[PDB]
Amino acid sequence: VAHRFKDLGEENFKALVLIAFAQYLQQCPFEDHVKLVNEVTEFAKTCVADESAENCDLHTLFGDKLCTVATLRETYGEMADCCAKQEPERNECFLQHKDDNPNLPRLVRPEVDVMCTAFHDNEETFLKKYLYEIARRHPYFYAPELLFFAKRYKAAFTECCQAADKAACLLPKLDELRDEGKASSAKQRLKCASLQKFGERAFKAWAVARLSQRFPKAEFAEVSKLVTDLTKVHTECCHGDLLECADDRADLAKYICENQDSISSKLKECCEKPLLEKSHCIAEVENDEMPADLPSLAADFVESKDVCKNYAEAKDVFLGMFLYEYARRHPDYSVVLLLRLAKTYETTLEKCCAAADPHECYFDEFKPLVEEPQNLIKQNCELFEQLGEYKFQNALLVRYTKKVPQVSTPTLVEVSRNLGKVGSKCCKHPEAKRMPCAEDYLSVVLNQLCVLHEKTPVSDRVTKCCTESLVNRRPCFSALEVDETYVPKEFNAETFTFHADICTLSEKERQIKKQTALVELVKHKPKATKEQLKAVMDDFAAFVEKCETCFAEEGKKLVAASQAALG
Numbered sequence: 001v002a003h004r005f006k007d008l009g010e011e012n013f014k015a016l017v018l019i020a021f022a023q024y025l026q027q028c029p030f031e032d033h034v035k036l037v038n039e040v041t042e043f044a045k046t047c048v049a050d051e052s053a054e055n056c057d058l059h060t061l062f063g064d065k066l067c068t069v070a071t072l073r074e075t076y077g078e079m080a081d082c083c084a085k086q087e088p089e090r091n092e093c094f095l096q097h098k099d100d101n102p103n104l105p106r107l108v109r110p111e112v113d114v115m116c117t118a119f120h121d122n123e124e125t126f127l128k129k130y131l132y133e134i135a136r137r138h139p140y141f142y143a144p145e146l147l148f149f150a151k152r153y154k155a156a157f158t159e160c161c162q163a164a165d166k167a168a169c170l171l172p173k174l175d176e177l178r179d180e181g182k183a184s185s186a187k188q189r190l191k192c193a194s195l196q197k198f199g200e201r202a203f204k205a206w207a208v209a210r211l212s213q214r215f216p217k218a219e220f221a222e223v224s225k226l227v228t229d230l231t232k233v234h235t236e237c238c239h240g241d242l243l244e245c246a247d248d249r250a251d252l253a254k255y256i257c258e259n260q261d262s263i264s265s266k267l268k269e270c271c272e273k274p275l276l277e278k279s280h281c282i283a284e285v286e287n288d289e290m291p292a293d294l295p296s297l298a299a300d301f302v303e304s305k306d307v308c309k310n311y312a313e314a315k316d317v318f319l320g321m322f323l324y325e326y327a328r329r330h331p332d333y334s335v336v337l338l339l340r341l342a343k344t345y346e347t348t349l350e351k352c353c354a355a356a357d358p359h360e361c362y363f364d365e366f367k368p369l370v371e372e373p374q375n376l377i378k379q380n381c382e383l384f385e386q387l388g389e390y391k392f393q394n395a396l397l398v399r400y401t402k403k404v405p406q407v408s409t410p411t412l413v414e415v416s417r418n419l420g421k422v423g424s425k426c427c428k429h430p431e432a433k434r435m436p437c438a439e440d441y442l443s444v445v446l447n448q449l450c451v452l453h454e455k456t457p458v459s460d461r462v463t464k465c466c467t468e469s470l471v472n473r474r475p476c477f478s479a480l481e482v483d484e485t486y487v488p489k490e491f492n493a494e495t496f497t498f499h500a501d502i503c504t505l506s507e508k509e510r511q512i513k514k515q516t517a518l519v520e521l522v523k524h525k526p527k528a529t530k531e532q533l534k535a536v537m538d539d540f541a542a543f544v545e546k547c548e549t550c551f552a553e554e555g556k557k558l559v560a561a562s563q564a565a566l567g
């Protein structure tokens with residue numbers, strides 16, 4: 001506990017133990033946690049100053065101080081029972097009572113002027129409360145990674161609270177953090193879903209694919225070492241024992257840094273960075289440049305005499321070899337595309353080795369699979385370029401509403417709004433880095449949607465895509481065609497009742513309400529052309545800009561016009 005305090009430092013240690021205590025005890029107030037944090041820091045500094053304290057000589061002390069919460073009986077009944085248990089069982093029992101989506105209040109982001117005042121008047125009390133608040137709202141979310149957002153949030157506040165128009169400064173930077181943080185919370189949930197739902201082999205494959213792309217100058221042996229190491233750390237990070245998940249992540253971070261030459265040049269920045277930030281930086285590292293003049297996969301994976309021999313001798317390792325060579329050659333491909341190829345390659349080699357001449361039987365078949373997302377990025381990033389972030393969200397909104405109108409309107413807005421944000425972040429990345437970027441943000445937004453589909457299931461079609469494999473989630477969602485079986489929702493004047501709100505509203509709130517209406521319009525009349533949607537959208541555009549008095553009358557013109565025009 002002394003050794004841990006020194007490497008993280010007091011500010012990160014106090015923040016981590018606050019995050020960690022917020023993650024375990026989600027239902028004691030902030031002041032109860034601060035009390036525990038200051039008592040733990042005082043106690044860690046006892047160990048740092050002396051180490052002679054018999055209490056000092058990490059899992060146990062964390063568990064001990066958990067049990068020092070009095071309101072454990074009242075507030076968190078089932079959670080407090082672990083204090084009866086001894087420490088092998090006790091810490092395992094504690095991790096069991098963390099709540100994945102704890103359905104606490106939506107955190108209200110106050111006005112930028114308000115936040116900046118509280119950040120001036122008492123910044124740590126400000127940040128540390130909101131950290132605690134985010135941390136108890138996300139208990140599985142890896143405590144140091146969340147601390148990197150707190151630092152990024154403190155960075156956003158320190159830079160934007162002094163700025164000209166702090167709305168124009170901070171609100172984009174808080175949206176950047178909320179979105180990256182929502183992406184980073186949802187990435188953690190997905191990678192832990194991956195391990196359970198699709199299996200260790202599927203995760204390892206992804207790991208192989210991810211690590212081979214990120215570290216192409218690394219050996220397959222080296223990648224395979226990291227892939228398993230990575231799989232252990234995630235296994236520990238999904239369980240929710242954050243101390244052992246952190247140890248294993250740091251163990252791997254210190255391992256990657258000791259073997260950089262055999263792994264990647266790009267890790268130099270990360271390996272210089274401290275223990276706390278090492279893991280995250282290695283995870284965030286740029287793909288190294290692929291080695292000068294590597295041979296295409298057709299020699300060692302089609303034309304070699306030893307293809308079916310080496311495949312049958314170790315099916316995971318050879319397909320992992322295949323994945324490795326392909327992913328190192330193609331960091332431009334999504335990790336799930338490389339797994340699609342690997343799965344296809346497996347499917348061919350199961351067929352081809354049994355087939356009389358495997359050489360003739362067994363790379364052409366990858367060209368449709370590669371082109372499909374690469375055309376999807378191209379189409380969508382053409383549609384993003386020509387329409388811009390908002391109108392692209394609307395393109396998708398009508399697309400995904402028509403496709404799966406059974407899904408609730410706020411979800412359809414938010415998925416499509418976040419899918420616009422996927423489009424926004426990844427179309428700005430070059431053609432090479434486009435599909436990987438998407439994969440990441442897209443798979444987050446799709447797993448977000450499938451988690452929203454858990455405990456509000458609405459469509460057969462979306463649930464098929466969610467219950468489809470890791471590799472097949474997005475193709476299935478792309479494969480979604482307009483629901484011809486959707487009986488259109490009854491004309492709902494409530495949704496198409498436009499109050500005066502829209503003009504004064506900030507573009508975000510204005511956009512969502514327009515988008516809300518646009519979903520409900522497409523739910524009312526799904527058989528309604530792009531031209532007919534442009535007709536209603538530019539009826540609305542002329543109507544809102546021309547417009548308290550007008551909304552009731554001129555609005556009801558547009559509505560009757562639209563009901564007629566669409567069928």
Ligand SMILES: CCCCCCCCCCCCCC(=O)O
Nearest residue numbers: 210211214249252253279282283
């Ligand atoms: C360094 C310890 C764990 C960090 C992961 C490093 C692997 C680099 C590839 C990035 C894969 C996603 C991040 C992750 O697996 O945690």
Ligand SMILES: CCCCCCCCCCCCCC(=O)O
Nearest residue numbers: 202204205316319320339342343
């Ligand atoms: C979810 C479908 C993925 C299918 C990918 C087929 C290739 C599997 C390779 C598994 C990698 C083994 C890991 C290792 O080499 O250590």
Ligand SMILES: CCCCCCCCCCCCCC(=O)O
Nearest residue numbers: 514517518521537540541559562
């Ligand atoms: C009965 C149909 C009424 C619903 C109309 C919803 C249209 C919303 C999308 C158009 C947004 C206007 C363009 C703009 O000002 O940004």
